[PDB]
Amino acid sequence: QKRAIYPGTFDPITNGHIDIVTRATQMFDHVILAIAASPSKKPMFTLEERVALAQQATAHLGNVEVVGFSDLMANFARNQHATVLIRGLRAVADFEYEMQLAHMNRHLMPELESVFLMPSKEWSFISSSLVKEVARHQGDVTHFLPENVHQALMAKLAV
Amino acid sequence: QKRAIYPGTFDPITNGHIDIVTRATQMFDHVILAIAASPSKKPMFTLEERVALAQQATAHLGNVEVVGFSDLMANFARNQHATVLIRGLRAVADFEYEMQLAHMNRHLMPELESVFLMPSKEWSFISSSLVKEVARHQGDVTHFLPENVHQALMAKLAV
Amino acid sequence: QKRAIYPGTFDPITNGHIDIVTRATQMFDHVILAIAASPSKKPMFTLEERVALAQQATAHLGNVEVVGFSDLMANFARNQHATVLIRGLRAVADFEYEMQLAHMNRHLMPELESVFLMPSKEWSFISSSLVKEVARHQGDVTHFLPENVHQALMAKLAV
Amino acid sequence: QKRAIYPGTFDPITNGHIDIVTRATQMFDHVILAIAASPSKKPMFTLEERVALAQQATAHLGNVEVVGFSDLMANFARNQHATVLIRGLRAVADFEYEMQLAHMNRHLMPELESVFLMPSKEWSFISSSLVKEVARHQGDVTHFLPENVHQALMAKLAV
Amino acid sequence: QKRAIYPGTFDPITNGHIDIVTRATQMFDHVILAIAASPSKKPMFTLEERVALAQQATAHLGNVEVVGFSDLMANFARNQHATVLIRGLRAVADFEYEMQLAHMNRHLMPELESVFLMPSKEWSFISSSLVKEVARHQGDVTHFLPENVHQALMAKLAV
Amino acid sequence: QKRAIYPGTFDPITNGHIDIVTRATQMFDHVILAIAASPSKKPMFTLEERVALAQQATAHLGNVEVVGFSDLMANFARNQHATVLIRGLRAVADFEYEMQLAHMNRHLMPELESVFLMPSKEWSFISSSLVKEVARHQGDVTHFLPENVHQALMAKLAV
Numbered sequence: 001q002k003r004a005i006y007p008g009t010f011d012p013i014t015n016g017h018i019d020i021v022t023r024a025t026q027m028f029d030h031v032i033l034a035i036a037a038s039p040s041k042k043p044m045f046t047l048e049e050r051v052a053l054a055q056q057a058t059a060h061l062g063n064v065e066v067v068g069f070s071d072l073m074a075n076f077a078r079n080q081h082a083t084v085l086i087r088g089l090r091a092v093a094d095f096e097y098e099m100q101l102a103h104m105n106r107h108l109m110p111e112l113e114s115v116f117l118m119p120s121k122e123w124s125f126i127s128s129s130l131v132k133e134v135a136r137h138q139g140d141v142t143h144f145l146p147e148n149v150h151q152a153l154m155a156k157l158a159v
Numbered sequence: 160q161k162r163a164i165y166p167g168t169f170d171p172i173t174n175g176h177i178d179i180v181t182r183a184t185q186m187f188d189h190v191i192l193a194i195a196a197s198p199s200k201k202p203m204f205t206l207e208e209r210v211a212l213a214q215q216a217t218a219h220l221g222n223v224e225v226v227g228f229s230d231l232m233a234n235f236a237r238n239q240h241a242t243v244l245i246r247g248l249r250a251v252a253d254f255e256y257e258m259q260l261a262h263m264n265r266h267l268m269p270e271l272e273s274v275f276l277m278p279s280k281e282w283s284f285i286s287s288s289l290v291k292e293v294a295r296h297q298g299d300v301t302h303f304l305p306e307n308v309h310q311a312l313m314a315k316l317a318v
Numbered sequence: 319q320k321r322a323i324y325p326g327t328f329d330p331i332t333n334g335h336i337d338i339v340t341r342a343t344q345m346f347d348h349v350i351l352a353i354a355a356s357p358s359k360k361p362m363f364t365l366e367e368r369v370a371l372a373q374q375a376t377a378h379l380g381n382v383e384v385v386g387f388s389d390l391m392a393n394f395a396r397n398q399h400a401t402v403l404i405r406g407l408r409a410v411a412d413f414e415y416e417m418q419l420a421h422m423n424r425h426l427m428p429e430l431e432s433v434f435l436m437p438s439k440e441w442s443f444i445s446s447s448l449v450k451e452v453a454r455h456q457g458d459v460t461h462f463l464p465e466n467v468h469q470a471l472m473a474k475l476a477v
Numbered sequence: 478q479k480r481a482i483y484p485g486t487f488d489p490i491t492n493g494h495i496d497i498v499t500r501a502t503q504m505f506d507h508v509i510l511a512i513a514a515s516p517s518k519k520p521m522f523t524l525e526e527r528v529a530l531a532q533q534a535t536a537h538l539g540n541v542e543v544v545g546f547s548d549l550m551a552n553f554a555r556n557q558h559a560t561v562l563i564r565g566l567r568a569v570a571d572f573e574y575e576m577q578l579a580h581m582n583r584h585l586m587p588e589l590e591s592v593f594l595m596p597s598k599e600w601s602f603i604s605s606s607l608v609k610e611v612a613r614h615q616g617d618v619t620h621f622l623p624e625n626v627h628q629a630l631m632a633k634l635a636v
Numbered sequence: 637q638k639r640a641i642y643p644g645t646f647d648p649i650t651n652g653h654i655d656i657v658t659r660a661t662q663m664f665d666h667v668i669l670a671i672a673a674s675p676s677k678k679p680m681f682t683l684e685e686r687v688a689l690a691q692q693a694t695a696h697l698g699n700v701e702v703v704g705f706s707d708l709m710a711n712f713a714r715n716q717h718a719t720v721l722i723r724g725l726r727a728v729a730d731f732e733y734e735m736q737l738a739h740m741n742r743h744l745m746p747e748l749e750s751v752f753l754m755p756s757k758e759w760s761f762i763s764s765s766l767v768k769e770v771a772r773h774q775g776d777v778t779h780f781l782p783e784n785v786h787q788a789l790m791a792k793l794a795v
Numbered sequence: 796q797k798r799a800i801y802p803g804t805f806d807p808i809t810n811g812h813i814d815i816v817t818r819a820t821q822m823f824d825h826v827i828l829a830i831a832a833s834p835s836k837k838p839m840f841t842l843e844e845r846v847a848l849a850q851q852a853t854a855h856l857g858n859v860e861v862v863g864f865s866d867l868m869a870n871f872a873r874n875q876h877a878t879v880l881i882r883g884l885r886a887v888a889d890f891e892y893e894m895q896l897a898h899m900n901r902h903l904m905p906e907l908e909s910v911f912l913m914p915s916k917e918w919s920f921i922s923s924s925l926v927k928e929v930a931r932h933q934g935d936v937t938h939f940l941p942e943n944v945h946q947a948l949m950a951k952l953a954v
């Protein structure tokens with residue numbers, strides 16, 4: 001009965017994201033992994049690609065649902081009947097931005113609670129941006145990505 | 160079903176704590192507000208006082224239980240069959256210490272998840288320490304405390 | 319006789335800016351709200367639009383003067399006979415950047431003092447960028463903008 | 478016309494404090510350098526010593542007044558008819574605590590504005606605590622102190 | 637026998653960079669100042685220009701070698717037989733990013749040690765970006781750049 | 796040839812310290828692990844205990860020398876003919892204090908360079924203080940300590 005949304009750009013989904021969504025499914029009955037189209041960020045992968053990659057990478061988790069969206073995130077939460085919004089916290093920089101976003105989301109949807117999870121030590125220093133930057137210079141990022149995502153990233157960069 | 164602990168010194172409990180525990184009760188079935196018995200620095204209020212004040216200030220929340228404890232937070236969570244540890248996040252100093260505690264707690268009790276909540280803007284700058292310091296120097300702290308705590312703090316400082 | 323400048327991009331001016339400039343006029347005899355053309359930031363509103371919006375939003379403050387500029391900000395301060403440069407401080411990120419800018423400005427104009435004000439709790443989490451991002455997704459930002467600015471933002475996004 | 482207070486422990490006053498108060502005197506008509514009487518941690522110098530040292534070190538500034546006080550900072554500002562409270566900002570730890578104090582002071586005395594000034598690069602890493610710690614361990618701190626304070630600190634440490 | 641690499645975009649090299657590389661040559665036998673082509677950052681100066689500017693600005697240091705590169709930085713370190721990677725640390729923002737990069741580099745090349753140096757007070761607030769921004773508005777940046785670099789920057793902006 | 800000091804309280808030495816000193820020995824010819832004799836806060840272990848524990852835990856490193864000292868760090872470095880002072884960096888709180896210490900040490904001993912190293916992800920959240928606090932509250936800290944220190948800490952806490 002408790003529904004949570006885990007929103008992000010997931011360009012592409014990393015093992016840090018897999019850790020966060022896994023921890024969310026151990027707390028809440030149903031977790032919506034919500035992939036924002038994010039045209040302003042000029043993503044490497046299309047929304048359809050990101051959704052497909054995330055679906056395969058989370059297929060082993062029975063209470064996850066992957067959906068793409070372009071809406072205001074508070075409206076999308078309401079429309080999914082979610083009362084929790086999950087964010088992962090890595091460093092001070094995101095923490096300050098996440099605090100601003102959480103105050104804005106509270107204004108837009110007061111009954112949506114933002115809950116923050118801290119990453120595992122293994123993934124505390126990675127981001128999609130850092131992984132792409134390493135891969136673009138032909139550095140090994142197999143440790144940081146689900147197998148299907150790593151294959152897709154190698155293929156994208158080969159073109 | 161889902162059991163969460165909200166540990167702290169609560170010396171005394173403030174409206175920032177009430178905000179956090181209220182948010183936790185809207186997320187989880189049962190919330191244990193856990194008051195540490197023997198703080199490193201001699202608290203202004205005794206454990207018995209802190210428990211009584213917190214019980215009165217949370218009596219309106221049906222799924223809160225106020226309990227004193229003298230153990231390691233993770234040992235207490237384990238014995239209470241809690242799978243969520245609630246922490247409030249106010250500033251950067253908070254975030255960095257909390258990250259260290261969360262990594263340590265994951266080592267001590269892997270089946271315990273640390274969840275971080277953000278206070279309302281109204282309470283994001285207060286702490287029990289700041290309220291006590293202002294009150295001891297004859298400043299107005301009525302806005303930041305439950306009525307019963309306001310009364311108890313005035314009585315303490317009058318002697 | 320004490321003249322202060324409050325510089326920024328003001329794209330568009332928000333209620334956080336209104337709070338800062340209002341507080342500045344309670345401290346200093348004359349405040350110049352100085353709007354930088356900022357072509358490098360590709361602003362949503364033209365400089366003329368930003369100046370007009372800020373003029374209307376501050377018309378109730380008798381000792382404010384709104385001016386657009388493209389100059390080095392230390393030169394513009396000197397040319398306005400200002401000895402104080404006002405900046406609002408929201409989080410750690412701007413604080414560090416503001417410290418760098420203040421040291422550079424001190425090098426360029428040693429007699430120009432940078433003074434920093436802290437925002438009201440109400441506006442401590444907003445920025446022009448965040449308001450635009452919410453509005454672009456059709457979220458309600460009426461609370462955060464002067465009425466004339468909100469109308470102009472809705473109209474801009476309608477085209 | 479404009480009255481400002483610059484409160485602190487000044488145990489002892491350093492060249493960083495002299496820098497801040499000098500900058501304040503170039504901004505405001507009258508600056509009260511306000512020395513707290515009963516610090517939480519037993520100061521190295523008595524209140525009478527700290528006041529005498531600060532008076533000598535600021536005697537060349539015609540619009541500074543050095544005063545001891547034992548009250549809440551806002552209560553003292555109010556009774557001194559000050560409308561500006563001066564704080565120096567050095568690092569991130571400074572900024573976060575100062576933000577909390579400023580929000581509290583706005584609650585306690587809405588007609589008091591908190592103004593933050595930045596030290597010269599020369600003094601941005603010093604504090605009375607660091608200077609005392611270096612001096613007690615037989616390090617050279619002459620550069621960081623007014624001559625009279627250097628003399629008084631050497632005498633204190635010799636006994 | 638101890639070889640260190642000091643990588644960066646150096647667009648253009650500043651006196652802060654000169655300070656760091658000078659300190660590195662006092663610690664290590666041979667220092668490679670490694671200039672990344674950095675097309676993603678759309679540099680003002682071409683790689684060949686940046687290399688030539690850095691060579692002239694470090695010609696007085698006998699154990700510095702300036703080289704341009706487009707490789708993964710861990711691979712370039714290995715190929716230069718370097719076991720130390722030098723980074724300068726200015727503020728909290730770079731510190732957090734540098735920590736992420738250092739953890740990634742440790743994954744890619746475990747025997748490459750990242751060592752961080754703190755800048756002189758004189759250069760603690762400057763960056764290539766800030767210097768370019770000031771120069772683009774015709775502000776004086778002679779204090780912050782080697783003579784040859786300042787001439788080249790003035791000439792670039794004159795076109 | 797190159798002599799470095801690694802100063803600290805080491806109360807007790809942890810695996811984070813072992814990591815840092817091991818990294819330092821791979822960079823410099825001789826590393827002095829320097830244990831401060833009279834900490835500001837009464838250490839859990841006496842100086843003789845801390846030195847013996849650190850000697851045993853570093854006996855496998857051929858170019859480490861464990862020495863107690865009661866002086867200013869810079870005075871000790873100078874007398875040991877060290878030109879490098881090693882510090883470990885864990886978080887933002889670490890970074891800001893270390894920046895202040897490094898600027899002061901450059902004032903006290905210009906020929907001493909401060910070098911900052913980053914701990915493995917495995918140890919980036921631990922400190923002697925956190926380990927002691929967990930152990931005194933009956934938590935498992937075996938993973939974070941050399942075996943000899945684990946034994947000594949258990950014995951200390953048993954009495």
Ligand SMILES: Cc1ccc2nc(NCc3cc(C)nn3C)[nH]c2n1
Pocket residue numbers: 007008009036037038039070071072073074101104105451452455
């Ligand atoms: C309060 C607030 C601020 C910015 C927002 N952007 C959106 N929608 C798009 C979106 C959601 C996510 C996640 N990523 N992206 C690009 N909703 C917002 N809500």
Ligand SMILES: Cc1ccc2nc(NCc3cc(C)nn3C)[nH]c2n1
Pocket residue numbers: 166167168195197198199229230231232233260263264928929932
């Ligand atoms: C990981 C960790 C670190 C310190 C700890 N202290 C405790 N218990 C005592 C305690 C808890 C609170 C709240 N206050 N006090 C005094 N448990 C801990 N767990």
Ligand SMILES: Cc1ccc2nc(NCc3cc(C)nn3C)[nH]c2n1
Pocket residue numbers: 325326327354355356357388389390391392419422423769770773
């Ligand atoms: C020391 C320094 C650094 C950057 C500068 N940019 C300018 N002028 C343009 C400007 C001013 C403001 C406000 N916004 N913008 C875009 N003056 C500068 N001064």
Ligand SMILES: Cc1ccc2nc(NCc3cc(C)nn3C)[nH]c2n1
Pocket residue numbers: 292293296484485486513515516517547548549550551578581582
């Ligand atoms: C909001 C706030 C918080 C703490 C306060 N302490 C005081 N007065 C005592 C004081 C001032 C200084 C400087 N040092 N000392 C000991 N006024 C306060 N106001």
Ligand SMILES: Cc1ccc2nc(NCc3cc(C)nn3C)[nH]c2n1
Pocket residue numbers: 133134137643644645672673674675706707708709710737740741
């Ligand atoms: C771990 C990691 C992350 C990003 C990387 N980018 C590169 N090569 C290009 C590069 C090196 C420098 C310095 N600047 N630039 C643009 N190597 C990387 N290694």
Ligand SMILES: Cc1ccc2nc(NCc3cc(C)nn3C)[nH]c2n1
Pocket residue numbers: 610611614802803804831833834835865866867868869896899900
């Ligand atoms: C610049 C500076 C600041 C404080 C200092 N304290 C010392 N020596 C005493 C000391 C060193 C360590 C480690 N622990 N303890 C107690 N040297 C210092 N240098």
